[PDB]
Amino acid sequence: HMPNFSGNWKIIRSENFEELLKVLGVNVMLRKIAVAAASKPAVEIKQEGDTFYIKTSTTVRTTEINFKVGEEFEEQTVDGRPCKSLVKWESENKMVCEQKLLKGEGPKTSWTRELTNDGELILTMTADDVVCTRVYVRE
Question: How far apart are CA 47 and CA 81, in angstroms?
Answer without folding.
Answer: 26
